[PDB]
Design a binder for this molecule. Structure first.
Ligand SMILES: *C(#N)N1[C][C]2[C][C][C][C]([N]C3=[C][C]=[C][C]=C3C(F)(F)F)[C]2[C]1
Length: 203
Protein backbone atom coordinates (compact mmCIF):
# COMPACT_ATOMS: atom_id res chain seq x y z
CA UNK A 1 0.00 0.00 0.00
CA UNK A 2 0.82 3.72 0.04
CA UNK A 3 3.45 4.81 2.55
CA UNK A 4 6.88 4.28 3.90
CA UNK A 5 6.99 2.50 7.20
CA UNK A 6 7.83 5.97 8.57
CA UNK A 7 4.44 7.32 7.41
CA UNK A 8 1.41 5.54 5.95
CA UNK A 9 -1.60 7.20 4.45
CA UNK A 10 -4.43 5.67 6.47
CA UNK A 11 -7.21 7.35 4.45
CA UNK A 12 -7.96 10.22 2.09
CA UNK A 13 -11.15 11.37 0.37
CA UNK A 14 -12.46 14.41 -1.41
CA UNK A 15 -16.18 14.53 -1.01
CA UNK A 16 -19.39 16.49 -1.10
CA UNK A 17 -22.29 15.99 1.30
CA UNK A 18 -25.54 17.07 -0.34
CA UNK A 19 -27.39 19.78 1.62
CA UNK A 20 -30.08 17.25 2.61
CA UNK A 21 -27.52 15.23 4.60
CA UNK A 22 -28.37 17.35 7.66
CA UNK A 23 -31.63 15.35 7.74
CA UNK A 24 -30.51 12.00 6.28
CA UNK A 25 -26.78 11.57 5.80
CA UNK A 26 -24.99 10.54 2.62
CA UNK A 27 -21.70 11.62 1.06
CA UNK A 28 -20.38 11.61 -2.50
CA UNK A 29 -16.74 10.57 -2.85
CA UNK A 30 -15.02 12.02 -5.91
CA UNK A 31 -11.83 10.11 -4.93
CA UNK A 32 -11.02 7.94 -1.95
CA UNK A 33 -8.28 5.78 -0.43
CA UNK A 34 -8.63 3.71 2.73
CA UNK A 35 -5.91 1.42 4.10
CA UNK A 36 -7.27 1.34 7.69
CA UNK A 37 3.28 -6.23 -3.68
CA UNK A 38 2.68 -3.04 -5.66
CA UNK A 39 3.41 -2.44 -9.32
CA UNK A 40 5.96 0.10 -10.60
CA UNK A 41 6.23 3.01 -13.05
CA UNK A 42 9.54 4.45 -14.22
CA UNK A 43 9.76 7.98 -12.88
CA UNK A 44 11.00 9.33 -16.22
CA UNK A 45 7.69 8.38 -17.86
CA UNK A 46 5.86 11.11 -15.94
CA UNK A 47 8.63 13.72 -15.65
CA UNK A 48 6.96 15.73 -18.41
CA UNK A 49 3.61 16.04 -16.60
CA UNK A 50 5.20 17.92 -13.64
CA UNK A 51 7.72 20.77 -13.11
CA UNK A 52 11.29 20.42 -14.26
CA UNK A 53 11.78 23.04 -11.51
CA UNK A 54 12.94 23.30 -7.88
CA UNK A 55 10.26 21.13 -6.36
CA UNK A 56 9.95 19.13 -9.57
CA UNK A 57 9.73 15.39 -9.49
CA UNK A 58 13.20 14.70 -10.86
CA UNK A 59 14.90 16.91 -8.29
CA UNK A 60 13.06 15.42 -5.30
CA UNK A 61 13.68 11.85 -6.50
CA UNK A 62 17.40 12.55 -6.78
CA UNK A 63 17.25 13.73 -3.17
CA UNK A 64 15.62 10.39 -2.33
CA UNK A 65 14.60 8.19 -0.73
CA UNK A 66 13.30 6.17 -3.68
CA UNK A 67 11.03 4.01 -1.57
CA UNK A 68 9.09 7.17 -0.65
CA UNK A 69 7.91 8.01 -4.17
CA UNK A 70 4.58 6.75 -5.47
CA UNK A 71 2.01 7.30 -8.18
CA UNK A 72 -1.76 7.17 -7.60
CA UNK A 73 -3.99 7.05 -10.65
CA UNK A 74 -7.45 8.27 -9.67
CA UNK A 75 -10.69 7.46 -11.45
CA UNK A 76 -13.05 10.11 -10.10
CA UNK A 77 -16.80 9.66 -9.63
CA UNK A 78 -18.45 12.81 -11.00
CA UNK A 79 -21.96 11.28 -10.87
CA UNK A 80 -23.69 13.63 -8.42
CA UNK A 81 -25.43 25.15 -0.24
CA UNK A 82 -23.64 21.81 -0.13
CA UNK A 83 -20.37 21.07 1.67
CA UNK A 84 -17.32 20.16 -0.45
CA UNK A 85 -14.56 18.69 1.70
CA UNK A 86 -11.14 17.01 1.74
CA UNK A 87 -9.99 14.79 4.64
CA UNK A 88 -6.65 13.03 5.00
CA UNK A 89 -5.11 10.85 7.68
CA UNK A 90 -1.59 9.46 8.14
CA UNK A 91 -0.01 7.20 10.75
CA UNK A 92 3.52 7.03 12.16
CA UNK A 93 5.30 5.35 15.04
CA UNK A 94 7.58 8.37 15.36
CA UNK A 95 6.47 11.67 16.79
CA UNK A 96 7.25 14.18 14.03
CA UNK A 97 5.85 17.46 12.83
CA UNK A 98 5.04 17.07 9.12
CA UNK A 99 4.97 19.56 6.28
CA UNK A 100 2.66 18.61 3.42
CA UNK A 101 3.16 20.49 0.15
CA UNK A 102 0.45 19.85 -2.45
CA UNK A 103 1.26 21.36 -5.85
CA UNK A 104 -1.15 21.45 -8.78
CA UNK A 105 0.73 21.38 -12.09
CA UNK A 106 -1.44 22.04 -15.13
CA UNK A 107 0.28 21.53 -18.48
CA UNK A 108 3.46 20.80 -16.52
CA UNK A 109 3.45 24.33 -15.06
CA UNK A 110 2.59 24.66 -11.38
CA UNK A 111 -0.40 26.95 -10.81
CA UNK A 112 -1.26 26.63 -7.11
CA UNK A 113 0.43 25.17 -4.01
CA UNK A 114 -0.78 24.60 -0.45
CA UNK A 115 1.74 23.86 2.29
CA UNK A 116 0.52 22.93 5.76
CA UNK A 117 2.00 21.73 9.04
CA UNK A 118 0.44 18.98 11.17
CA UNK A 119 1.70 17.65 14.50
CA UNK A 120 1.28 14.13 15.76
CA UNK A 121 -1.52 12.91 18.06
CA UNK A 122 -1.04 9.66 19.97
CA UNK A 123 -3.70 6.98 19.56
CA UNK A 124 -3.59 3.26 20.46
CA UNK A 125 0.13 2.84 19.91
CA UNK A 126 0.44 4.93 16.74
CA UNK A 127 0.96 8.64 16.11
CA UNK A 128 -1.91 9.85 13.91
CA UNK A 129 -1.85 13.00 11.73
CA UNK A 130 -5.34 14.37 11.08
CA UNK A 131 -6.41 16.95 8.48
CA UNK A 132 -10.13 16.12 8.45
CA UNK A 133 -13.15 17.92 6.97
CA UNK A 134 -11.02 20.64 5.51
CA UNK A 135 -13.25 22.73 3.20
CA UNK A 136 -12.50 22.24 -0.48
CA UNK A 137 -10.72 24.90 -2.51
CA UNK A 138 -13.07 27.09 -4.49
CA UNK A 139 -10.69 26.38 -7.37
CA UNK A 140 -11.54 22.68 -7.18
CA UNK A 141 -15.21 23.26 -6.45
CA UNK A 142 -15.92 25.29 -9.56
CA UNK A 143 -13.69 23.04 -11.66
CA UNK A 144 -15.82 20.06 -10.76
CA UNK A 145 -19.07 21.77 -11.68
CA UNK A 146 -17.59 22.65 -15.05
CA UNK A 147 -16.20 19.16 -15.54
CA UNK A 148 -19.49 17.44 -14.62
CA UNK A 149 -21.21 19.64 -17.24
CA UNK A 150 -18.92 18.17 -19.95
CA UNK A 151 -21.04 16.02 -22.30
CA UNK A 152 -18.72 13.07 -22.88
CA UNK A 153 -16.51 11.04 -20.59
CA UNK A 154 -13.58 11.10 -22.98
CA UNK A 155 -13.82 14.89 -22.86
CA UNK A 156 -13.39 14.86 -19.09
CA UNK A 157 -10.45 12.49 -19.29
CA UNK A 158 -8.74 14.66 -21.90
CA UNK A 159 -8.95 17.72 -19.67
CA UNK A 160 -7.93 15.74 -16.63
CA UNK A 161 -4.96 14.47 -18.63
CA UNK A 162 -3.58 17.99 -18.45
CA UNK A 163 -3.93 18.38 -14.66
CA UNK A 164 -1.65 16.65 -12.14
CA UNK A 165 -0.88 17.04 -8.45
CA UNK A 166 2.37 16.38 -6.60
CA UNK A 167 2.11 15.84 -2.83
CA UNK A 168 5.27 15.91 -0.73
CA UNK A 169 5.33 15.26 3.02
CA UNK A 170 8.52 16.16 4.84
CA UNK A 171 9.57 16.27 8.48
CA UNK A 172 9.57 19.95 9.42
CA UNK A 173 12.28 19.55 12.08
CA UNK A 174 14.68 17.43 9.99
CA UNK A 175 13.46 18.73 6.62
CA UNK A 176 13.78 15.20 5.21
CA UNK A 177 11.36 13.75 2.69
CA UNK A 178 9.05 11.09 4.06
CA UNK A 179 6.56 10.69 1.21
CA UNK A 180 6.09 11.95 -2.31
CA UNK A 181 3.00 11.00 -4.32
CA UNK A 182 2.22 11.98 -7.90
CA UNK A 183 -1.48 11.95 -8.82
CA UNK A 184 -2.96 11.58 -12.29
CA UNK A 185 -6.64 11.88 -12.90
CA UNK A 186 -9.24 10.14 -15.03
CA UNK A 187 -13.00 9.71 -14.67
CA UNK A 188 -14.85 6.58 -13.62
CA UNK A 189 -18.10 5.33 -15.12
CA UNK A 190 -21.36 6.35 -13.44
CA UNK A 191 -22.02 2.72 -12.40
CA UNK A 192 -18.38 2.37 -11.25
CA UNK A 193 -17.56 4.42 -8.19
CA UNK A 194 -14.37 6.28 -7.40
CA UNK A 195 -11.30 4.09 -7.84
CA UNK A 196 -7.55 4.32 -7.55
CA UNK A 197 -4.39 2.49 -8.43
CA UNK A 198 -1.16 2.94 -6.49
CA UNK A 199 2.28 2.39 -8.03
CA UNK A 200 5.85 2.78 -6.79
CA UNK A 201 7.98 5.29 -8.69
CA UNK A 202 11.20 3.48 -9.65
CA UNK A 203 14.23 3.93 -11.89
C1 LIG B 1 -8.27 22.80 -1.33
N1 LIG B 1 -9.05 22.99 -0.35
N2 LIG B 1 -7.62 21.61 -1.31
C2 LIG B 1 -7.02 21.21 -0.06
C3 LIG B 1 -5.64 21.02 -0.66
C4 LIG B 1 -4.69 20.40 0.35
C5 LIG B 1 -4.88 18.91 0.56
C6 LIG B 1 -5.40 18.14 -0.65
C7 LIG B 1 -5.28 18.85 -2.00
N3 LIG B 1 -5.85 17.99 -3.04
C8 LIG B 1 -5.33 16.80 -3.45
C9 LIG B 1 -4.05 16.36 -3.12
C10 LIG B 1 -3.60 15.13 -3.60
C11 LIG B 1 -4.38 14.32 -4.42
C12 LIG B 1 -5.66 14.71 -4.79
C13 LIG B 1 -6.16 15.93 -4.34
C14 LIG B 1 -7.56 16.35 -4.74
F1 LIG B 1 -8.08 15.43 -5.55
F2 LIG B 1 -7.52 17.52 -5.35
F3 LIG B 1 -8.29 16.49 -3.65
C15 LIG B 1 -5.83 20.30 -2.00
C16 LIG B 1 -7.31 20.61 -2.35
Amino acid sequence: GLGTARLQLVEFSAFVEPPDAVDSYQRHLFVHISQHPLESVDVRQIYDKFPEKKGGLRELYDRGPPHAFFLVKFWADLNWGGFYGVSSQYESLEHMTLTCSSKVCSFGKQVVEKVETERAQLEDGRFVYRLLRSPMCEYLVNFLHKLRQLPERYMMNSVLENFTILQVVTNRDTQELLLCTAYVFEVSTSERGAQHHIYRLVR
